[PDB]
């Protein structure tokens, strides 16, 4: 009972029912002509019909252009049928889910079983006393349809299910997850800048532990406000979702809770946004975020999640004040938007702007406060409220690139006990890129 309760969560069951059937809401939402389809009319599904097994009801009513010939009910792969027994216009699907077991792993007997009984029963809700059943064993991934038949559907179903059972992601969510539990997995770059909108989520600043006095003597753990850091590398408007420690009040270990509230924020942000401002990808260095993100990213098959293949330096976000100045002032959690690049889109493209930016983050990662002084050594040219980095001239930006660059190389050779003079180019470019 433990391992299962993992395997399904955030109502992964219900979500499965939506992904499958709703995705059919599309596929046969748009097939009007060839089957003589007026319109695709489905009943808004009460949230519990997915996991309630008492009794079922007609799902998606097909209301024909003209008229339809209902043969005697057969299976999807029960073949030879004379349609003209009846005629209807309105129809429906019954599409159902069950996790089978070594006694009953044969659906069809279940398909026609449930189908028949339901259809011939009162409580079962039907707009037409004709229809179709499509079941699935999640356990052995099987599926079927025992319906009445007017012509043309059969292969539409067949092939369409080939797709579904091989695609509609929720299933791929299981087959990932089941393999988690089982621990079976069969053995044996610059594109960041392409047109579609690419976002950076990095969560190391989300839950910040803070060490404090233990009544007697011990080391006390706590936390102080975080926020979720996301940006597109291109157009430089920062999305900070403020994390106000109130959030964590009473509950649990906040590792899991961190990851799940990060996911739920990122999702909510996405949903709320318009189709034009939505991303086509998401890129995160922390892979502990995979599952929470994904599981809340079932809802948008359009978007495609992609991890890092490569070593990355995003944890220094807070050490550059003004944003952190904002983090420490928040009375109640909220979004704030910012500007990443100061103004780097005039004198450059965002391209080497980002190269310099990563390098800045780096020398902020290794030696830190030396870099902070390097920046603000001469404050005698002053940063506006809108900028973050010290405003410069060409030369200043330039040489500071050189110097900040120099740190990790030198400190490197010294500190990691392998020489800087014996280096090969490609490892230099490596640490520089990562």
């Amino acid at each position: 009972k433990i391992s299962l309760i993992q395997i399904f969560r955030a109502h992964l069951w219900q979500k499965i029912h939506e992904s499958i059937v709703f995705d059919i809401c599309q596929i046969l939402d748009g097939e009007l002509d060839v089957l003589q389809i007026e319109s695709v009319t489905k009943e808004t599904v009460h949230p519990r019909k997915s996991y309630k097994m008492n009794s079922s009801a007609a799902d998606i009513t097909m209301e024909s252009v003209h008229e339809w010939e209902v043969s005697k009910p057969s299976l999807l792969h029960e073949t030879n049928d004379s349609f003209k027994g009846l005629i209807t216009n309105k129809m429906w699907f019954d599409v159902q889910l069950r996790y089978g077991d070594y006694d009953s792993h044969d659906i069809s007997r279940y398909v026609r079983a449930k189908f028949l009984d339901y259809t011939t029963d009162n409580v079962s809700m039907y707009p037409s006393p004709t229809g179709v059943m499509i079941g699935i064993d999640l356990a052995y991934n099987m599926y079927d349809a025992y319906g009445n038949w007017f012509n043309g559907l059969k292969p539409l179903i067949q092939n369409s299910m080939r797709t579904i059972m091989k695609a509609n992601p929720a299933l791929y969510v299981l087959r990932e997850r089941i393999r988690k539990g089982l621990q079976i997995y069969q053995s044996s770059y610059a594109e960041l800048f392409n047109n579609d909108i690419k976002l950076f989520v990095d969560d190391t600043n989300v839950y910040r532990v803070t060490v404090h006095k233990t009544f007697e003597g011990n080391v006390a753990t706590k936390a102080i406000n975080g926020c979720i850091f996301t940006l597109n590398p291109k157009t430089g408007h920062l999305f900070l979702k403020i994390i106000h420690t109130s959030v964590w009040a009473g509950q649990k270990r906040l590792s899991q809770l961190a990851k799940w509230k990060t996911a739920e924020e990122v999702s909510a942000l996405v949903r709320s946004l318009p189709k034009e401002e939505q991303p086509k990808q998401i890129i995160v260095t922390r892979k502990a975020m995979l599952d929470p993100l994904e599981v809340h990213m079932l809802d948008f098959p359009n978007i495609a999640i992609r991890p890092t293949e490569l070593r990355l330096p995003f944890s220094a976000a807070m050490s550059i004040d003004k944003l952190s100045d904002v983090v420490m002032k928040a009375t109640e959690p909220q979004m704030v938007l910012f500007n990443i690049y100061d103004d780097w889109l005039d004198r450059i493209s965002s391209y080497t702007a980002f190269s310099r930016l990563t390098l800045l983050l780096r020398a902020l990662k290794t030696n830190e406060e030396s870099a902070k002084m390097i920046l603000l050594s001469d404050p005698t040219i002053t940063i506006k409220s809108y900028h973050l980095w010290p405003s410069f001239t060409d030369e200043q930006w330039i040489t500071i690139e050189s110097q900040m660059r120099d740190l990790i190389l030198t400190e490197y050779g010294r500190k990691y006990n392998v020489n800087i003079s014996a280096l090969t180019q490609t490892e230099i470019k490596d640490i520089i890129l990562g």
Binding site: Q26, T163, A167, N195, K275, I348, R405
Partner: protein, 88 residues
């Protein structure tokens, strides 16, 4: 809730022959339409995007960096110095 207007990539061409959508990272790669060049141009694939518009330029300047460096500035490393080189 899902926007019903914009099709999931994998439904674009149903036949299992079409092109492979690997549901983990949700990325079509080859394009879904390999048969009929659509009368009106139609998703042309993911790969059809990657070269386009803002990354080529980068590829060029980086070529100029390699070959210049044998001919000492570094694209990723010091950008603007090189950059204004490639300008000149």
């Amino acid at each position: 809730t899902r926007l019903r207007e914009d099709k999931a990539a994998y439904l674009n061409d149903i036949n299992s022959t079409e092109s492979n959508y690997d549901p983990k990272s949700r990325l079509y790669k080859t394009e879904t339409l390999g048969a009929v060049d659509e009368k009106s141009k139609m998703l042309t694939g993911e790969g059809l995007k990657l070269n386009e518009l803002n990354q080529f330029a980068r590829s060029h300047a980086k070529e100029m960096g390699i070959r210049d460096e044998i001919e000492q500035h570094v694209l990723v490393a010091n950008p603007t110095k090189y950059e204004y080189l490639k300008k000149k």
